[PDB]
Amino acid sequence: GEFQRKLYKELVKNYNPDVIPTQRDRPVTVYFSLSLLQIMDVDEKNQVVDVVIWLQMSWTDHYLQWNVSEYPGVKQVSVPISSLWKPDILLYNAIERPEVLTPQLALVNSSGHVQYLPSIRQRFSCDVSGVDTESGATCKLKFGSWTHHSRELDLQMQEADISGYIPYSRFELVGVTQKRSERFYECCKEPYPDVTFTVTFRKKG
Amino acid sequence: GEFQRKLYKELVKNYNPDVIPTQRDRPVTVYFSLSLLQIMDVDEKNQVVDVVIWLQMSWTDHYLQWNVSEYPGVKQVSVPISSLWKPDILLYNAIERPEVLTPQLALVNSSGHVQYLPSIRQRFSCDVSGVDTESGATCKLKFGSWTHHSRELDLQMQEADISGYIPYSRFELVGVTQKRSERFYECCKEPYPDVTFTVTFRKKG
Amino acid sequence: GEFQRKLYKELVKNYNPDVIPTQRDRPVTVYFSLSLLQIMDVDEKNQVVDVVIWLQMSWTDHYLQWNVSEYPGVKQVSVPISSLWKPDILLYNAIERPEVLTPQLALVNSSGHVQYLPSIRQRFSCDVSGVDTESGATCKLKFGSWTHHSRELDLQMQEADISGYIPYSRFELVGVTQKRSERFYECCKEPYPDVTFTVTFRKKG
Amino acid sequence: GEFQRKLYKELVKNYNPDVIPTQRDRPVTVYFSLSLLQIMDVDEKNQVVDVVIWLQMSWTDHYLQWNVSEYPGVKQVSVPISSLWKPDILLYNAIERPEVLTPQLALVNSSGHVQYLPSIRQRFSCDVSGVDTESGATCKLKFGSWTHHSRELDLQMQEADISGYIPYSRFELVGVTQKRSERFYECCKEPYPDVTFTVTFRKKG
Amino acid sequence: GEFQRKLYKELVKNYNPDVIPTQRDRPVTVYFSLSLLQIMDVDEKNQVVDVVIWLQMSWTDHYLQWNVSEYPGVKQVSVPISSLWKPDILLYNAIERPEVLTPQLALVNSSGHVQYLPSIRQRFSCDVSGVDTESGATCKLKFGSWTHHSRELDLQMQEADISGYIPYSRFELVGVTQKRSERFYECCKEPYPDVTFTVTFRKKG
Ligand SMILES: *[C@@H]1O[C@H](CO)[C@@H](O[C@@H]2O[C@H](CO)[C@@H](O[C@@H]3O[C@H](CO[C@H]4O[C@H](CO)[C@@H](O)[C@H](O)[C@@H]4O)[C@@H](O)[C@H](O[C@H]4O[C@H](CO)[C@@H](O)[C@H](O)[C@@H]4O)[C@@H]3O)[C@H](O)[C@H]2NC(C)=O)[C@H](O)[C@H]1NC(C)=O
Ligand SMILES: *[C@@H]1O[C@H](CO)[C@@H](O[C@@H]2O[C@H](CO)[C@@H](O[C@@H]3O[C@H](CO)[C@@H](O)[C@H](O)[C@@H]3O)[C@H](O)[C@H]2NC(C)=O)[C@H](O)[C@H]1NC(C)=O
Ligand SMILES: *[C@@H]1O[C@H](CO)[C@@H](O[C@@H]2O[C@H](CO)[C@@H](O[C@@H]3O[C@H](CO)[C@@H](O)[C@H](O)[C@@H]3O)[C@H](O)[C@H]2NC(C)=O)[C@H](O)[C@H]1NC(C)=O
Ligand SMILES: *[C@@H]1O[C@H](CO)[C@@H](O[C@@H]2O[C@H](CO)[C@@H](O)[C@H](O)[C@H]2NC(C)=O)[C@H](O)[C@H]1NC(C)=O
Ligand SMILES: *[C@@H]1O[C@H](CO)[C@@H](O[C@@H]2O[C@H](CO)[C@@H](O)[C@H](O)[C@H]2NC(C)=O)[C@H](O)[C@H]1NC(C)=O
Ligand SMILES: CN1[C@@H](CC(=O)c2ccccc2)CCC[C@H]1C[C@H](O)c1ccccc1
Ligand SMILES: CN1[C@@H](CC(=O)c2ccccc2)CCC[C@H]1C[C@H](O)c1ccccc1
Ligand SMILES: CN1[C@@H](CC(=O)c2ccccc2)CCC[C@H]1C[C@H](O)c1ccccc1
Ligand SMILES: CN1[C@@H](CC(=O)c2ccccc2)CCC[C@H]1C[C@H](O)c1ccccc1
Ligand SMILES: CN1[C@@H](CC(=O)c2ccccc2)CCC[C@H]1C[C@H](O)c1ccccc1
Ligand SMILES: O=C(NCCCO)c1cc(Br)c(Br)[nH]1
Ligand SMILES: O=C(NCCCO)c1cc(Br)c(Br)[nH]1
Ligand SMILES: O=C(NCCCO)c1cc(Br)c(Br)[nH]1
Ligand SMILES: O=C(NCCCO)c1cc(Br)c(Br)[nH]1
Ligand SMILES: O=C(NCCCO)c1cc(Br)c(Br)[nH]1
Ligand SMILES: O=C(NCCCO)c1cc(Br)c(Br)[nH]1
Ligand SMILES: O=C(NCCCO)c1cc(Br)c(Br)[nH]1
Ligand SMILES: O=C(NCCCO)c1cc(Br)c(Br)[nH]1
Ligand SMILES: O=C(NCCCO)c1cc(Br)c(Br)[nH]1
Ligand SMILES: O=C(NCCCO)c1cc(Br)c(Br)[nH]1
């Protein structure tokens, strides 16, 4: 569409994806949740879990807003995430890079709200010695910004999902809880928030 | 050809491959089909299937059309798919990224119709516990746009293929059916279409 | 050389490597041959062969010619293949992308004749159930353009090679024959050519 | 922030990340330390250790400083490490490239001090034949600049860490020492510094 | 340094890394040597050797020289090898691409002499059936330009190294010799030089 093309032309003009879109010392609030689509494997010897997780991230970037009357009909645009600022959220437990299974695209609406929903295949470290018991194994998946404290990037939780779990995998999901925290570290004056998912599962065997 | 060179020079001038080529709120219709060239492996423990599939996608991009009388002789051009908009179609069942086996080129004709026919090696999740039975295992391969609803991208089916199947693999293909759906999701007002291929196969023994 | 530098400066100026260098509806003739340097492995379970093959491709690109009297001393130049048009030749039997073992460079002479001789490590599909028999296994390696028909790209065969075969591998090469064909496909009006190498080999044990 | 955006615009203008930011023949001092987060595996046959290590590097780049009164509020910025000069520090014992697990971002303050803290998964060569003894196996992890001698890049040590070690891995960390050295090599007039970590560990079983 | 920054700015201005820096039909002399740091593995079944080798390459590029009085203090610069012309030297025996373990940087001095010293992990083909004998296995590692004959690129040998060999690997290095040759091939009028390293080794038991 013609108004879409003009809209994209304006991004490349003025926008720097390296700059976190804070304003007036207000943080950028990033909503974060997770759906555990699969447990692919559990390596009992090496204390590693292999999962597919669907992350849901959303935030407002004030630099991405436009006047709906100046680009009529254009309600949302699909945009390569590499051309936007994105949260530098890291899974602390990860022992390999993530493999992103989905197109690397974000949805952005007229008031600059961005939705980025990557599905990833990820291996991470966890004590899984309980996995063949009734109790199962319980792993923590701690997520947080690598470089931004609470006054720059305000990580916030949202309602999660057991409904995406693939029923035919050889592990059953006993449950998932989630918790947001602020911690300090000896380096830095300001607190860093994290959102941690506690996941309990066991072998169907 | 000299007219070919002038024709390509015009693409780089006006064209943004990030923008879906809708016009007048009309969707872009994308025709989608599949030929299952091979079942390479079936991992019974991890519930994974390894295939080579040949996808056939085609759509019209109105920005790619030209006057055949102004570029005489030039009936179709071979073009890197990376310089065109392409459908963000995803295999929902995939547990790894696809490996594209074919040149990343599309054919485009004078009225802007694009053919993109990648062959991919792909591993995906499926309940394969039936694979050593007469009934075999039946897997769904659901394909759909990750970011575009029906009013932007109208996914449509076409005539599929058993004729490419490699006869000497250790799995025999019992059959393939296909089905198009529109579904809604709790988020979004507009429906997303998918095309799903149901594939039944079994070990030869 | 100083004349070499001026010669390269002229490529970047006028040349588009995406455009097949046909002229006056005449095809570009591409000469194609192969030397099978090694059979690395044969996977009897998965019906896969692992080889190193040395391809020899050559064609004339009329846009790459220059006046030898205007660039004196410059008889041929070594050029990154990515900055030239190259044939989009594909091994139809391949089940993984190729791994190129050689510098990605082509030789080009003053009348625009290009030599490109990549050595590749490649795994491909083949019925190898005969490999521990006197008859051995016989595999077809079919090569062809993915996007260009006979009137654009005229694929032509040349004299091949058993002399590069590594004598100490655990497979012996019984023989190699080669054949050029034209086929039609239901889509397209024009025929596509291929060059197929039939390779027979067996386990030494 | 608006002052943040103007600040980044000035980097791209004047700055070359290939140039080591020495001044007045003074070296760039790079502070270096390590936290050994995990021993993932030990390959006794191939004499290889697989670890995750968290490196802490910091240096001053005089070209990155700014006036705090001219960019009010802007105390530190998060920046892609690829757009800054970075130390070419190498783990001498490495037998594969590193896999970086963290966002490739550095913190930079107003006086051009840069903090870069990558976590890496890395396999390296070590005599591990002692690993199931009380004494354990003792490995050297020698780190140093690949191309800069002491008068250009002054590598300096800092206080290290056993406290990050994951308690549930099947190896226990006995102890870590660290040592800085200057050596000469027959080639070169100037000495090269290194920082070496000696790490002792053993199988728990 | 300020003079360093101006020096780099001049490279990007005038220099093309695709052009071999011959002058007055004189070849570019490339000095080549090798230190075999490790034998990682020997695959007896597939006739493959896995090594880490440290290559030492040096040549003069007349386009890289500068006046020391015009860039005072600047004696050598560390430069990404991708921004310089480099020899297209190939290990003829290689069955996989190399993995470069070192920063991809070269040293260049004021008279345009370039030092490039990559350490690589490389698997290559060799008859290793002797590896469990007193005699051991003897492999040839033949290195040479892929596209340049002797009158363009004059490959020359230098004094090599057993002193880097890791003492704790399960193979002992019996010896390494080296030899330079000129050969002709039926295609081409001019001879191609190579430098071959003969390496003898055996399992320690
Ligand atoms: C951007 O970030 C950088 C790094 O954090 C900051 O630069 C540092 O600034 C601090 C504070 O000014 C410096 O700390 C001071 O350093 C003095 C010199 O230290 C060096 O030299 C001595 C030997 O003479 C060594 O022992 C020492 O390890 C260093 O090599 C010290 O003398 C100071 O110590 C005294 O004051 C402190 C504070 O009151 C007392 O607690 C001490 O007991 C002591 O009496 C002091 O530690 C530091 O050197 C700088 N680091 C670097 C790496 O350069 C920038 O300030 C920051 N920019 C902005 C705008 O904030
Ligand atoms: C650029 O390279 C090409 C390819 O190497 C050169 O063309 C080839 O030149 C050979 C040798 O001269 C030709 O063979 C000759 O054919 C005639 C009969 O037709 C015969 O009299 C000779 O004995 C010899 O066999 C060959 O046909 C030709 N091949 C192709 C594909 O064009 C070309 O000369 C080079 N250009 C320049 C400017 O050097
Ligand atoms: C940049 O580094 C290169 C390589 O170290 C330097 O070139 C080398 O310079 C030395 C001393 O000038 C040369 O030695 C001389 O060689 C000649 C001819 O063979 C001989 O007759 C003399 O007795 C003397 O030994 C050396 O050959 C030369 N090497 C190469 C490969 O060119 C260069 O000088 C350095 N430049 C600066 C400014 O540091
Ligand atoms: C852009 O998207 C956001 C998020 O979907 C919309 O903001 C929400 O608006 C609804 C009420 O209309 C409420 O759920 C919340 O108050 C908002 N959510 C958040 C996360 O801020 C916003 O309306 C959209 N803008 C437009 C113009 O459509
Ligand atoms: C470009 O290709 C498309 C698809 O092959 C052509 O559209 C078809 O036109 C024929 C008319 O003979 C119809 O019967 C088909 O049903 C059309 N298909 C679709 C999807 O539109 C188009 O005509 C071609 N353009 C040119 C100039 O040849
Ligand atoms: C179609 N898709 C979303 C696409 C979208 O709007 C989107 C994409 C990318 C970024 C931002 C938004 C909208 C909500 C449904 C979802 C698909 C399903 O939940 C799903 C996802 C992953 C595995 C299995 C099933
Ligand atoms: C030759 N090729 C197509 C090439 C083309 O025109 C094309 C390429 C790329 C984009 C658009 C069109 C046209 C239809 C036939 C096909 C070849 C065979 O079906 C095949 C496909 C996959 C594996 C094995 C064999
Ligand atoms: C030296 N080299 C070629 C290099 C060249 O001129 C060339 C390179 C790239 C493009 C165009 C031409 C020319 C023909 C001989 C060949 C060497 C041997 O046959 C060989 C090839 C592959 C594996 C093992 C041995
Ligand atoms: C939050 N994070 C650092 C982030 C930061 O300031 C930083 C990042 C990148 C560049 C420069 C600075 C500061 C120190 C604490 C650390 C987190 C924890 O110790 C940790 C590190 C590695 C693995 C597991 C856990
Ligand atoms: C410090 N380093 C070289 C670094 C340099 O100046 C250099 C780097 C890159 C390009 C040109 C020159 C110079 C010669 C010594 C070498 C280190 C040692 O041999 C070594 C190599 C590999 C494993 C263990 C030890
Ligand atoms: O340039 C953009 N917004 C500024 C408003 C100018 O009217 C913008 C945001 C997104 Br998402 C795109 Br595409 N462009
Ligand atoms: O590992 C992560 N960060 C590194 C990015 C590439 O260097 C990461 C990001 C997200 Br979202 C997850 Br889950 N992990
Ligand atoms: O997984 C797919 N897309 C990922 C994009 C890169 O992150 C994908 C596309 C198609 Br067609 C298939 Br099958 N999978
Ligand atoms: O720019 C193109 N066409 C529009 C102008 C008509 O003269 C165009 C289409 C394709 Br396909 C290429 Br390449 N360029
Ligand atoms: O798979 C092939 N082509 C895809 C595009 C580049 O990877 C291919 C080409 C050749 Br030659 C072989 Br063998 N495979
Ligand atoms: O510019 C080139 N050819 C056109 C002729 C201009 O007089 C050219 C061909 C090659 Br190969 C290079 Br490098 N440049
Ligand atoms: O095969 C080599 N080069 C191909 C192009 C770059 O990947 C090569 C060079 C050297 Br030195 C070795 Br060992 N292999
Ligand atoms: O440009 C920067 N600093 C110089 C000040 C000129 O106004 C600079 C440093 C960093 Br980190 C960024 Br982003 N910009
Ligand atoms: O610019 C450079 N040399 C061209 C001649 C001007 O004196 C040059 C060489 C190297 Br290494 C760099 Br960085 N720049
Ligand atoms: O090998 C290293 N550097 C080369 C650049 C590409 O990997 C390296 C750096 C560090 Br820190 C480690 Br550990 N390895």
Domain ranges of chain C: 1-205
φ and ψ at residue D4, rounded to 5 degrees = -60, -45
Nearest Cα residue in chain B from C18:
B79
Residue to mutate, A62, A111, A114, ligand 4, most ligand atoms under 8 Å from C-beta:
A111
- Find the E123 Cα to ligand 15 centroid distance in Å: 22
> Is C49 buried (19+), middle (13-18) or exposed (0-12) by CB count in 10 A?
buried
β-strand pairing of C137-145 with C89-91: antiparallel
Is D189 in CB contact (< 8 Å) with chain A? no
Cβ separation of D25 and E73 shorter than 8 Å? Answer: yes
Which run of H or of E encompasses E46?
none
Q: Which amino acid is at D180?
A: R
* Partners of B39 in beta bridges: B51
Tell me how far CA of residue B156 lies from CA of A78, B21, C191, in angstroms. 21, 17, 28
The ligand with the least distance to the CA atom of D75 is 1
Tell me how far CA of residue D45 lies from CA of D127, D202, E130, E162, E169, in angstroms. 10, 16, 20, 23, 9
> Is B148 buried (19+), middle (13-18) or exposed (0-12) by CB count in 10 A?
buried
How far, in Å, CA of D56 to CA of D67, rounded?
A: 26
In sequence order, which residues have a C-beta less than 8 Å from that of residue A24 and are 6 or more positions away?
none
Which CATH number is A1-205's, of 3.40.630.90, 1.10.3720.10, 2.70.170.10, 3.65.10.10? 2.70.170.10
Dihedral of alpha carbons A84, A88, A94, A96, sign? positive
In sequence order, which residues have a C-beta less than 8 Å from that of residue A106 and are 6 or more positions away?
A78, A79, A80, A81, A84, A86, A114, A115, A116
CB of D189 within 8 A of CB of D125? no
**Can you tell me whether residue E8 is helix, strand or coil?**
helix
Tell me how far CA of residue D101 lies from CA of A39, A101, D117, E102, in angstroms. 21, 18, 11, 19
Is E73 in CB contact (< 8 Å) with chain D? yes
A40 CB under 6 A from ligand 11? no
Ligand 8 atom with the smallest distance to the CA of C106 is 10
**Can you tell me whether residue A2 is helix, strand or coil?**
helix
Tokens of C205: 């044990």
Cα distance between the two ends of chain D: 54
How far, in Å, CA of A77 to CA of B87, rounded?
A: 14
Which run of H or of E encompasses B80?
strand B76-80
Tell me how far CA of residue A93 lies from CA of A144, A152, C157, in angstroms. 11, 23, 55
How far, in Å, CA of D86 to CA of D82, rounded?
A: 8
DSSP result, C45-78: TTTEEEEEEEEEEEEEEEEEE--TTTSTT--EEE
How far, in Å, CA of A201 to CA of A176, rounded?
A: 9
How far, in Å, CA of B52 to CA of B100, rounded?
A: 10
Cα distance between the two ends of chain E: 55
- Find the B190 Cα to ligand 2 centroid distance in Å: 64
Nearest Cα residue in chain A from D205:
A45
How far, in Å, CA of D135 to CA of D123, rounded?
A: 22
CB of A140 within 8 A of CB of A177? no
Q: Helix-strand-coil percent breakdown of chain A, rounded to 5?
A: 10, 50, 40
How far, in Å, CA of D119 to CA of D130, rounded?
A: 27
**Can you tell me whether residue B187 is helix, strand or coil?**
coil
Residues of chain C with Cβ-Cβ distance to B161 below 8 Å are none
How far, in Å, CA of C198 to CA of D15, rounded?
A: 57
In sequence order, which residues have a C-beta less than 8 Å from that of residue E7 and are 6 or more positions away?
E66, E71, E74, E77
Q: Is B110 left (phi over 0), alpha (psi -120 to 50) or beta?
A: alpha
C49 CB under 6 A from ligand 15? no
CA nearest ligand 16 atom 8, residue? C11
In sequence order, which residues have a C-beta less than 8 Å from that of residue C160 and are 6 or more positions away?
C33, C34, C35, C176, C178, C197
Of the candidates D159, D119, D149, the residue with the CA atom closest to the CA atom of residue D31: D159
β-strand pairing of A28-43 with A153-157: parallel
How far, in Å, CA of E123 to CA of E142, rounded?
A: 13
Strands (E), chain C: 28-43, 48-65, 76-80, 89-91, 99-100, 105-109, 111-116, 119-125, 137-145, 153-157, 171-183, 192-203
Ligand 5 atom with the smallest distance to the CA of B58 is 20
Residues of chain D with Cβ-Cβ distance to E8 below 8 Å are 16, 18-19
Q: Which amino acid is at B34?
A: L
A contact residues 89-108, partner B, Cβ 8 Å cutoff: 99-103, 105, 107
Cβ separation of C95 and B38 shorter than 8 Å? Answer: yes
Residues of chain D with Cβ-Cβ distance to E169 below 8 Å are 47, 125
Residues of chain B with Cβ-Cβ distance to A40 below 8 Å are 46, 95
Q: Which amino acid is at E178?
A: Q
Tokens of D152: 């250009």
Q: Where are the alpha helices (DSSP H) in chain D?
A: 2-14
D115 CB under 6 A from ligand 9? yes
Residue to mutate, A28, A29, A32, A113, ligand 4, most ligand atoms under 8 Å from C-beta:
A113
| Residues, chain B | 205
DSSP letter at C94 equals B
Cβ separation of B100 and C97 shorter than 8 Å? Answer: yes
Resolution in A: 2.6
- Find the D5 Cα to ligand 11 centroid distance in Å: 16
- Whether E and D touch, i.e. at least 3 CB pairs below 8 A, reads as yes
β-strand pairing of E105-109 with E76-80: antiparallel
Residues of chain C with Cβ-Cβ distance to E47 below 8 Å are 168-170
β-strand pairing of A171-183 with B119-125: unpaired
Q: Where are the alpha helices (DSSP H) in chain A?
A: 2-14
Given A9, A103, A107, which is nearest B90 (Cβ)?
A103
How far, in Å, CA of A158 to CA of A149, rounded?
A: 19
In sequence order, which residues have a C-beta less than 8 Å from that of residue D29 and are 6 or more positions away?
D59, D60, D154, D156
Tokens of C73: 């001393």
- Find the A75 Cα to ligand 4 centroid distance in Å: 12
Tell me how far CA of residue C179 lies from CA of C32, C33, C195, in angstroms. 11, 11, 6
Cα dihedral angle (C41, C42, C46, C51), rounded to 10 degrees? Answer: 60
Which run of H or of E encompasses B31?
strand B28-43
Of the candidates B19, B187, B140, the residue with the CA atom closest to the CA atom of residue B88: B19
CB of E202 within 8 A of CB of E172? yes
Experimental method: X-ray
Q: How many CB pairs under 8 A join B and C?
A: 57
**Can you tell me whether residue A163 is helix, strand or coil?**
coil
The CB-based long-range contact list for A175-179 (8 Å cut-off, 24+ gap) reads A175/A199, A175/A200, A176/A36, A176/A200, A178/A33, A178/A34
